[PDB]
Design a protein around this ligand. Sequence first.
Ligand code: FES
Length: 106
Amino acid sequence: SKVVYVSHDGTRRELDVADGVSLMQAAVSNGIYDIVGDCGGSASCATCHVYVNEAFTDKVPAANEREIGMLESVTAELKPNSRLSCQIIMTPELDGIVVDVPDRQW
Ligand code: FES
């Protein structure tokens, strides 16, 4: 399934992500270092922060308590559509989803 990562400078990168893989795993596995899973993907850091395109913000599963609490630690601006990419798990239903990588993760 397709996932589009948009850098701060507008650079777009499209990856084919398998079912069950998180957006953080796909990013780090394909050189999108601007996203770094410091904690390893267990919602214990905020370095995998991304902005889910408003066209998918209400499709993807809502953030749980752990994520909501960890989001307050993001270094970039915390927007309404801010999410931790390690919490977004790919499925065919998310094909075409677009996420913007923040200017910084620290
Ligand atoms: S990789 Fe640590 S919260 Fe996502």
